[PDB]
RNA sequence: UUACUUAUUCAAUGAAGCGGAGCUGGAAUUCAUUUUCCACGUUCUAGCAUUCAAGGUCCCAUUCGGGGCUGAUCCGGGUUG
RNA sequence: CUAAGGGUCGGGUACGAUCAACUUA
RNA sequence: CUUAUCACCCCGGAAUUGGUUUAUCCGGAGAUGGGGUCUUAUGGCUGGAAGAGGCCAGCACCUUUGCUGGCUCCGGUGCGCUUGUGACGGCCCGUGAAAAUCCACAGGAAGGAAUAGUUUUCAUGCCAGGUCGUACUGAUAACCGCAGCAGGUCUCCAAGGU
RNA sequence: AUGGGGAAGCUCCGUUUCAAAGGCCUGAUUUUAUGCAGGCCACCAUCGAAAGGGAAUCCGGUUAAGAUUCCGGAACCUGGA
């Protein structure tokens, strides 16, 4: 019940990963592949625009 | 040194936490704040009658200190210079049985309306100066058209708090001069000319010259948008 | 007489709208700076049954511009519309379905939906399920759009007005027979007291203008002036016909 | 019938970006350096975005490390219709 | 009285005792 | 301490399609198969705890009071009844409150070297927890119907046989 | 309720509205505890359930009548250096 996560430890409530209590593996493994992908990606879209600096 | 980065930050539409600017042309005013400023706008718009817009119509800086500077040679007195005065006055006359006239005939800035405008109706008045700050405008209105009908001279100036400071007050609305020293009649003759050539000659003028009519900066530039718009071709 | 039931409405004691259970007032996002000299994107995050309205409702999540925080905005669901999608909100936002492009910004024939009256307003014209908005063309000069609403009127409004794209979600609600009582009892109770519904020619003529007499008839015409005070409006009030309608009506 | 807005009326917002001048460039392009308007440089994706912001330029007993300016143009304080 | 209808194991590459309940005819 | 349907992870990569519920769903978006965590869900064992309580046998013989000896152990069965739980499936133009409250996560402000600094979400230790209600009836006599009135008045538990 | 607006007035509307409606850390830390530059806001009253949501207790014994409250054991929760 929401009262007695007061006097229990932090082991039960988390586990031993990034957003470990709050968002499940599989989750967090796709926001892993998603964050690196979008940023990558966009070093790709600055590239592309960044030719028109050497065009003109 | 090489350990630090350039990030920059891009502030457009959606693309980051826009940073703090000066908001200080949005600010949600109190409603005090609100009616001060609206106000004035109100009494700028409108058509002001030549009774008004004779006033917010003083003189120049430059005048208005060197008359303060003639002026405050003739203050009147203090608490301090009464109770100094009327003991030496009460011992003067066991001494020397003088009717008090021992004490000195004071030469002061004669203030107060009521006691200014009895001042100009019996003539008495050799200079005067009029506030443009008294907020209900109808104690002052009639002053330069009193002062000219009379034919007093009359300066209508910037501040009724300096008009208090100079006759030890907080507000004064008028100030006077009646009679001035031997010494320095030649400073007054001087400063009434030009006095006379800023407000009472043109007094007649500006009773014909309306003030207000003024819109606001939007209002202005569409108002040169049209201008512009139809001289282009 | 006695006050009768249309007039007793007004009061607003029993007739007030049950919202228990909706998930409030179904808005578009403020329009504020973003939404007219860019776009914004926001993300569906659920599309959900609100009781008492045939349509579905759509909650996205904006960012907020100024500060650090997701701003949560209940749009009306328009068809095909899914969870996980990305919305863009706008002058320069797309003209795909679920964008709340500007009236002006959007082609002729733009089939829009929960349309603004007045830019700002956040939306008032075509909202109920199934239903849409057609953009009939513009008039730049004085800058204003004219629109087909869902009744069939015509409408002209200023073209900073928003919608969004697609018709909304739900439609074909109304072609499936309630055929049971019960099941109009469900419908009401979730929205308000209007149902059952007893005619006035049943009641006594304390009760009704229609009521009364030794067999069940209104009596009078049952077309009622506009001019007529309250205690009279039952009927067909202010009617340019009646009767069965035959053929069209130029629409 | 109208070259208006301040009275009055209506609607939103934590009154956040309004009106001009405009800074590199686009344009059926001026016959003499600016005669309108825009990026003010975000659309494959259910990630992220906050700590006077990082950077940059002149200064300090670089002693909890800091200051100014700029990044983020200026002017008008009409919050916006 | 009769018949039918179930559950539990050790595999050198068709086998059994156990045990069990009310439905039918 | 141990104990789960569901869920998830690792590993051969599946048409002769396989697994599988009473109910037919699931699998290259990775099935079957083989290996793998936690929620006293629920059960089991131990502590609590046999010293309690219950069942027998025996002594007390007018100080409004006990003492003694045992036993309390093993199971089995089910379309059973009731309640709870679970995984499901059906229904809706009906999709079936709110807030207090509690925790978790993201983050990276601040702080930490001569017996020191933090861990008081680990264990153990210390003190306090006020106020108001608490009997009884709840109905052919404790309520309301003029009454100890065949009326009215909300709800929980629920043995055997047929 | 207030803000405010009606109402001759008992009062009526209004509940966030056209209102100037906001804590905790070594700030300071010796006429000092606000003599005095230490942040985040964008909170807007309050009442309304003895069947809704909720912090935490059980067994055995005990009375003429009370007990999940007394007693004997055995626990838990909240606050607190």
Redesign the interface.
């Known amino acids: 019940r929401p009262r007695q996560y007061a006097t229990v430890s932090k082991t039960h409530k988390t586990v031993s990963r990034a957003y470990g209590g709050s968002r499940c593996a599989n989750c967090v493994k796709e926001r892993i592949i998603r964050a690196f992908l979008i940023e990558e990606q966009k070093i790709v879209k600055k590239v592309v625009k960044e030719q028109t600096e050497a065009a003109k | 040194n090489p350990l630090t980065h350039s990030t920059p930050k891009n502030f457009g539409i959606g693309q980051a936490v826009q940073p703090k600017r000066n908001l200080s042309r949005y600010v949600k005013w109190p409603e005090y704040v609100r009616v001060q400023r609206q106000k004035k706008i109100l009494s700028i718009r409108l058509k002001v009658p030549p009774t008004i817009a004779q006033f917010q119509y003083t003189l120049d800086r430059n005048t208005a200190a060197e008359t303060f500077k003639l002026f405050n040679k003739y203050r009147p007195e203090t608490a301090a210079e009464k109770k100094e005065r009327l003991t030496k006055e009460a011992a003067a006359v066991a001494e020397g049985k003088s009717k008090q006239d021992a004490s000195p005939k004071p030469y002061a800035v004669k203030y107060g309306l009521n006691h200014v405008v009895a001042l100009i109706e019996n003539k008495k008045a050799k200079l005067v100066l009029i506030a443009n700050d008294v907020d209900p405008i109808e104690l002052v209105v009639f002053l330069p058209a009193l002062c000219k009908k009379m034919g007093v001279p009359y300066a209508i100036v910037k501040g009724k708090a300096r008009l208090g400071t100079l006759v030890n007050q907080k507000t004064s609305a008028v100030a006077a001069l009646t009679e001035v020293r031997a010494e320095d009649e030649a400073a007054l003759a001087k400063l009434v000319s030009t006095i006379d050539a800023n407000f009472a000659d043109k007094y007649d003028e500006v009773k014909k010259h309306w003030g207000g009519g003024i819109l606001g900066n939007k209002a202005q530039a569409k108002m040169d948008k049209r201008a512009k718009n139809s001289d282009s071709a | 007489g006695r006050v009768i039931r249309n007039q007793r409405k007004g009061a607003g004691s029993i007739f007030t709208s049950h919202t228990r259970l909706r998930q409030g007032a179904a808005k578009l996002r403020t329009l504020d700076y973003?939404e007219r000299?860019?776009?914004?994107?926001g993300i569906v995050k659920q599309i959900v049954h609100d009781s008492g309205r045939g349509a579905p409702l759509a909650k996205v999540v904006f960012?907020?511009?100024?500060?650090?925080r997701l701003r949560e905005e209940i749009f009306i669901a328009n068809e095909g519309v899914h969870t996980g999608q990305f919305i863009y909100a706008?002058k320069?936002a797309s003209l795909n379905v679920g964008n709340v492009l500007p009236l002006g910004s959007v082609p002729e024939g733009t089939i829009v939906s929960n349309v603004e009256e007045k830019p700002g307003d956040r939306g008032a014209l075509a909202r109920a399920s199934g239903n849409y908005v057609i953009i009939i063309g513009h008039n730049p000069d004085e800058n204003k759009t004219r629109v087909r609403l869902p009744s069939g009127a015509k409408k002209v409004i200023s073209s900073d007005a928003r919608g969004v794209i697609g018709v909304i979600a739900g439609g074909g609600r109304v072609d499936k027979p309630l055929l049971k009582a019960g099941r109009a009892f469900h419908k009401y109770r979730l929205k308000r007291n209007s149902w059952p519904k007893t005619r006035g020619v049943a009641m006594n003529p304390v009760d009704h203008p229609h009521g009364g007499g030794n067999h069940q008839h209104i009596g009078k015409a049952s077309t009622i002036s506009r001019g007529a005070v309250s205690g009279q409006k039952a009927g067909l009030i202010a009617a340019r016909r009646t009767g069965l309608l035959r053929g069209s009506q130029k629409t």
């Open positions: 973003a000299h860019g776009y914004i994107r960012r907020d511009p100024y500060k650090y706008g320069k």
